[PDB]
Design a protein around this ligand. Structure first.
Ligand SMILES: *[C@@H]1O[C@H](CO)[C@@H](O[C@@H]2O[C@H](CO)[C@@H](O[C@@H]3O[C@H](CO)[C@@H](O)[C@H](O)[C@@H]3O)[C@H](O)[C@H]2NC(C)=O)[C@H](O)[C@H]1NC(C)=O
Ligand code: NAG
Ligand code: NAG
Ligand code: NAG
Ligand code: NAG
Lengths: 210, 109, 119, 118, 105, 52, 118
């Protein structure tokens, strides 16, 4: 029992594209002549850009941060540890899911579309029908490939900018009580305990006090 | 595990307070949420972030937390407020997991 | 002297994506938008079995070819299936007028009832 | 957002039951989804939940080892399967959504639920 | 935003600036007041009008296009004509929507 | 006035333009000063053949 | 850039006259447009102007209350309407373009004009 059928076999999927057969019966995905169509949702993987943050002055990523995309790593007399940033990760997740949904909703489903038969004295209309089919297939393949190619680059630049914005925020908060030593870290001129680190991460660092 | 009084009763038009007492591992270091459940219906969120109210909740419901014990307060008691009230928290030390309160039955007269 | 650092995420994924400026870029997360797998069977469409002619074609099925005696009972279907070896049509030589138009007409019929028009 | 579960289930001791939850809107979600059960005359209990994009799943220690939570993203569906079913597993089941992408105590939207009986 | 200026470290806009898009607000002993910046606003206006004109000029005007009639023995060509019409309509709808969506960002 | 973006929906903007028209007058009217030909109860065959 | 106006107008006291100005090139302009009139044997006089995108309109105190300047952007046209017309309103009218997007004293391109008579 199935919902989509092709002369080669039945299809059981929810993806928006397929490359099995142009002839379908039922509710089937759009047919393209492509071989690969993968859409990026995460950032560049460096286990061990336009804005120069990812693989720029921050050379590599952290495998110890598991609950987010961007975050902090602290170390003081109490101890060291990682901590993800929730607001930036939430905004990035909202944007990426919105982008994927927009991509999905712009490609409508394919309905029943079967071939026709012509006699030996009807070659002109047969050729016209074949030409129409081939032209539409080529146009849609081009559209899909171009869309994926552009959106991947946009996503990567999005993440690269999101990292640098957080870096600039933290730098602005630590005007003169911290020293910029490169690689994305700041070294404190005073004693910053757990409460001070929490205040730095929250966004309400008390500059006059320290 | 959080503990609440088994039942509280009051006349209509009065104010009631329900306590949720835990330990330093659940309430003393994390926020507390308050849910309301009617017979045959799924629980409905009343209070989050220990004092914040979602859209649509009447002003007369309020909440607070003082150390290891949270409190929920209802004013202008009505006949339709007779339901079960639960306190939930994010216990996190061995393996973090949501913990609900023991439950408190609020009866109107 | 106490320090705070800013960084990003990394895992052990090995999925790659293509960009207009670079190829084979490894990313942390991705999704696949293309399907290329089937089961290789002809199967019922929403609880209704298809009509498989077999050795016969449309002309042999409707005309009542002696080789299609197994098709005299079918009355409902979801789609019609034909084979490249379907060659039992009009046994007596001749011309079938507007055969492709009849095929196009039957391509939008779900059931019929066969009755004796002249006993 | 509306969360709808499947129909009622009546099974036998030692069996395995898989239930589903479908959410309205776009197929891809930006919030975590958890599963909560309630016994007759008892308070609610939390099994576990699933996180978007990252895909990590968390379970309670009581149900650890015999509950599995998966998600079909393109269909917008989330499945929870319970195995080694016993007599006490009869209950009333809901799928609840959170405010953010992380599993927490704050569930703001609940489904109608489905009943599981042995 | 990608550059963190609007709704970034400058949280809100000014309703007192009426003659431009970007400007200054000063305050000293003489007094306070707003003043728009002319060069940046002019360059932005030039760019935006150029973008709108480019969008307009790429879509040509539709001429006369009416339907056809077919008999009861000409269903194949009728279906082909309908398929052609629907395909072209879908393609152009997709193009317009995608163009607007990208240019807004 | 709000616009739609691939990353966000319903964004209020200071200025915008509308590129779609969805209004007509609901009448059959002359095209550049020449009136149309309205057959009415007849068709082309009855118009050319001279139907009574 | 070329600015062209409509034809000559002959009207009656107490009427209202609407004139138009069309500019070549792209339908959308990056410059403001003003309206200037001249009496026989007199110097030019300025009524008001319109600003692109922002759409604000400015008028002179003499003609304030009985002149209206509008713009059709997709057609690339600018309309100026004068009401409560009188005997002295007969004049020679031009539409003039400015160098920038703001109304100022520097008008660099003028049209041929049209004559309004009572
Ligand atoms: C249904 O179709 C089959 C073919 O798929 C028909 O069988 C074929 O009938 C033709 C009749 O001309 C046979 O050709 C003749 O074969 C004999 C064999 O001795 C040969 O001597 C003749 O010169 C001629 O070539 C053909 O062999 C035969 N094929 C098979 C596989 O049997 C069948 O008659 C059709 N039934 C109908 C129309 O009712
Ligand atoms: C954290 O930041 C929020 C943002 O307004 C503020 O309300 C809260 O008081 C801050 N908490 C601390 C401990 O600084
Ligand atoms: C990545 O590591 C996890 C455990 O941290 C493991 O379950 C997974 O199989 C690994 N992936 C690959 C591709 O090796
Ligand atoms: C990308 O990787 C595939 C698989 O290893 C390889 O066939 C292809 O040549 C690579 N592309 C480039 C541009 O190197
Ligand atoms: C945008 O606004 C319209 C009108 O209020 C509303 O119907 C629509 O749901 C909104 N879009 C989103 C994504 O909320």
């Amino acid at each position: 029992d199935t919902t989509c059928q092709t002369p080669n076999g039945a299809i059981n999927t929810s993806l928006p594209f397929q490359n099995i057969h142009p002839v379908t019966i039922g509710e089937c995905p759009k047919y393209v002549k492509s071989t690969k169509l993968r859409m990026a949702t995460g950032l560049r993987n460096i286990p061990s850009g336009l804005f120069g943050a990812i693989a720029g002055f921050i050379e590599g990523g952290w495998t110890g941060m598991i609950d987010g995309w961007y975050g902090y790593h602290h170390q003081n007399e109490q101890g060291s540890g990682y901590a993800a940033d929730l607001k930036s990760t939430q905004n990035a997740i909202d944007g990426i899911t919105n982008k994927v949904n927009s991509v999905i909703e712009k490609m409508n489903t394919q309905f029943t579309a079967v071939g026709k038969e012509f006699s030996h004295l009807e070659r002109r209309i047969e050729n016209l029908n074949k030409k129409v089919d081939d032209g539409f297939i080529d146009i849609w393949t081009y559209n899909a490939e171009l869309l994926v190619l552009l959106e991947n680059e946009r996503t990567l630049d999005y993440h690269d900018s999101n990292v640098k914005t957080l870096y600039e925020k933290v730098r602005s908060q630590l005007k003169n009580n911290a020293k910029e030593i490169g690689n994305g870290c700041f070294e404190f001129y005073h004693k910053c305990d757990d409460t001070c680190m929490e205040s730095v991460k929250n966004g309400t660092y008390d500059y006059p006090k320290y | 595990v959080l503990t609440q009084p088994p039942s509280v009763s009051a006349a209509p038009g009065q104010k009631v307070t329900i306590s949720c007492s835990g330990s330093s591992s659940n309430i003393g270091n994390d926020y507390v949420s308050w849910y309301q459940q009617l017979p045959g219906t799924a629980p409905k969120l009343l209070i989050y972030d220990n004092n914040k109210r979602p859209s649509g909740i009447p002003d007369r419901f309020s909440g607070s937390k003082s150390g290891t014990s949270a409190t929920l307060g209802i004013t202008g008691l009505q006949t339709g407020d007779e339901a079960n009230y639960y306190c939930a928290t994010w216990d996190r030390r061995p393996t973090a997991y949501v913990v609900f309160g023991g439950g408190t039955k609020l009866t109107v007269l | 002297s106490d320090k705070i650092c800013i960084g990003y995420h990394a895992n052990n994924s090995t999925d790659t994506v293509d960009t207009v400026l670079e190829k084979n870029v490894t990313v942390t997360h991705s999704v696949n938008l293309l399907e290329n797998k089937h089961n290789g069977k002809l199967c019922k469409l929403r609880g209704v079995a298809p009509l498989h002619l077999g050795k016969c074609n449309i002309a042999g099925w409707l005309l009542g070819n002696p080789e299609c005696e197994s098709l005299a009972t079918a009355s409902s279907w979801s789609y019609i299936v034909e084979t490249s070896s379907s060659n039992n049509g009009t046994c007596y030589p001749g011309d079938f007028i507007n055969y492709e138009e009849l095929r196009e007409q039957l391509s939008s019929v779900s059931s019929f009832e066969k009755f004796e028009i002249f006993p | 957002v509306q969360l709808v579960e499947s129909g009622a289930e009546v099974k036998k001791p030692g069996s395995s039951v898989k239930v589903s939850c479908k959410a309205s809107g776009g197929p891809f979600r930006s919030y975590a989804i958890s599963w909560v059960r309630q016994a007759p005359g008892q308070g609610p209990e939390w099994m576990g939940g699933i996180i978007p994009i990252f895909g990590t799943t968390k379970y309670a220690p009581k149900f650890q080892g015999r509950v599995t939570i998966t998600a079909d993203d393109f269909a917008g569906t989330v499945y929870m399967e319970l195995s080694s079913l016993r007599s006490e597993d009869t209950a009333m089941y809901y799928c609840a959504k959170h405010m953010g992408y992380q599993v927490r105590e704050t569930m703001d939207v609940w489904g109608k639920g489905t009943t599981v009986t042995v």
